[PDB]
Each structure stands twice: as C-alpha cells, then as structure tokens.
C-alpha cells in the first residue's frame, strides 16, 4: 500500500504569561513515532514508538537541534502575524505547520506538502507542483514574495522528493512488524428498540489498522444516508482503531438493511445483516 510521513507543529501565544506553548509530533501512516513538548521535562526530541528507540545519540541530538529551531521560528511567526494583521497583544493566537511526503506501493515519491494555518485557517501552502505558493490573503502575499526571493520552494522540493522519502523507507524497513501490518476489522451488529415503531441498528468495526475504513448502510441495495449516524474513527489506545455507523429503521423492516465494510485487511468487503 501507499505510505506517508508527516510532521505537525503547533505554537500557541500566551499573553501576559511568557513564552508560547510548542508541540511537535511526527507520524508514519497512523503511527506516532516522535514528539517534542515545551511543557515536558527533557527539552529533547523524544521516541514514541519502539522501533525508533534504536536510533543512536547522533540522531536524537540532530532532531533536538532542529525541533528547537522550528520552535524559535514559530515563536517569531506569532509576532510577525500579529503585526501583519495589526492585532492587539491581549489575545492568544495559533500558528500550525504540517509538512511531509507520500510514497506509492513501490515506495517511490508520490506527493509532498508544506503548509500553514493561522488561528485555524489556511494562511499559505506549497502547491502540488512543489514550485509555487497559494496565499490565502493580502498578508500571506507578503510571505509568498519573501519566500520566492529566498527560494524556499526549491529547498522544500529537494527535501520532499529526497530526504523525506529516503527516511520514510528507512523507517518502514526498521518499523516493519508495526508499520507494514494490516489488521482487519472485527465486525458485529447491535440493536436497540427505540419504540413500537422504530429500532436502531449499529454496525461496529473494531481492532483495525490502518485507520482508513468505509462503513455504509444500504436499504434494498441502495446507499442510504437519511437517518444514519457515523462517528469519527477513534483510537483504541493499543495501536488499533474503532468506528461505528447506525441507522434508525421502522420496526419489523430490519431485513431490508445491510451494513457494508471496506478495509485494506479485508480481501472482500463484508456485508452484515440483523436478525431478531
């Protein structure tokens, strides 16, 4: 299957309360493998998966230097954007950055990303071509022009198509048992009488990896989204995920309805039906 490496950064200003909170996390696919937190004790980049613990002190020292430099960057960014938007010193603001790379089944480069939000909305992003920028407004045009003169896109393109992909392959080899697995969902159905006239059917998918899954209800063979409820896919806390989808149906007509489950670990999609 295809794979990704993504780094996520969040800097939050603290008016009257000192230095910003900064939190950085790194993922391969849906598995977290590193963090840095300004609130934590070590002030180092730290392991969060077993397979990365065997990297030596040169790796940790390097990652620590860089992540601290990313922290200082976003500390300055908070002040810069406050100035661009002429915002008061009174309020807390947020800068977020994500970057990383996708590779196909051949483990060859497919796509790269490097993008920012300010207070929860897009600010600037590197376009899919890795040569040009999308600026959300007139403030972000200032940053776009700056980054064009400093050839930021060229630098990012080199990392994204090179270093990013190289290390993602290294991590997939060395985290093999964890990262290259597929755990198919364990499925079942539950039922609640709502009244004499209605019932709820709930179709469950449990203990699956990776997180990507599709749960759909049909009635007589037809996709049915009226009177359905689909919860966000959620972590179990052991490395797997969970999801459910429910439908409210008229009493006695439960046999019309089918739950369909699609997942990488299932060689054929599953159909579930409820019987009394």
């Amino acid at each position: 299957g295809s794979h990704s490496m993504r780094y996520f950064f969040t800097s939050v200003s603290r008016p009257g309360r000192g230095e910003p909170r900064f939190i950085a996390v790194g993922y391969v696919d849906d598995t977290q493998f590193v963090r840095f937190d300004s609130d934590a004790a070590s002030q180092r980049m730290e392991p969060r998966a077993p397979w990365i613990e065997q990297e030596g002190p040169e790796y940790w020292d390097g990652e620590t230097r860089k992540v601290k430099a990313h922290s200082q960057t976003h500390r300055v960014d908070l002040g810069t954007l406050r100035g661009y938007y002429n915002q008061s010193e009174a309020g807390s603001h947020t800068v977020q950055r994500m970057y990383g790379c996708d590779v196909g089944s051949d483990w060859r480069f497919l796509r790269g990303y490097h993008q920012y939000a300010y207070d929860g909305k897009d600010y600037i992003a590197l376009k899919e071509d890795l040569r040009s920028w999308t600026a959300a407004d007139m403030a972000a045009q200032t940053t776009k022009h700056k980054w064009e003169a400093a050839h930021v896109a060229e630098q990012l393109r080199a990392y994204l198509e090179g270093t990013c992909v190289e290390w993602l392959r290294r991590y997939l080899e060395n985290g093999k048992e964890t990262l290259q697995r597929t755990d198919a969902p364990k499925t079942h159905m539950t039922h609640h009488a709502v009244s004499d006239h209605e019932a709820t059917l709930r179709c469950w998918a449990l203990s699956f990896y990776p997180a990507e899954i599709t749960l759909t209800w049909q009635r007589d063979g037809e996709d049915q989204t009226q009177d359905t409820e689909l919860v966000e896919t959620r972590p179990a806390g052991d490395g797997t995920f969970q999801k459910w989808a429910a439908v409210v149906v008229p009493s006695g007509q439960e046999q019309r309805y089918t739950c369909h489950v699609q997942h990488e670990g299932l060689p054929k999609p599953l159909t579930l039906r409820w019987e009394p």
Binding site: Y7, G26, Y59, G62, E63, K66, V67, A69, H70, T73, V76, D77, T80, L81, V95, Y99, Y116, Y123, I124, T143, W147, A150, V152, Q155, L156, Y159, T163, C164, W167
Partner: peptide
Amino acid sequence: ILGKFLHRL
C-alpha cells in the same frame, strides 16, 4: 527526520 528549515513567515 525533520527538514533543516529556518524560513520565517
């Protein structure tokens, strides 16, 4: 690994 990235907005 992280990028060696220093660019500011």
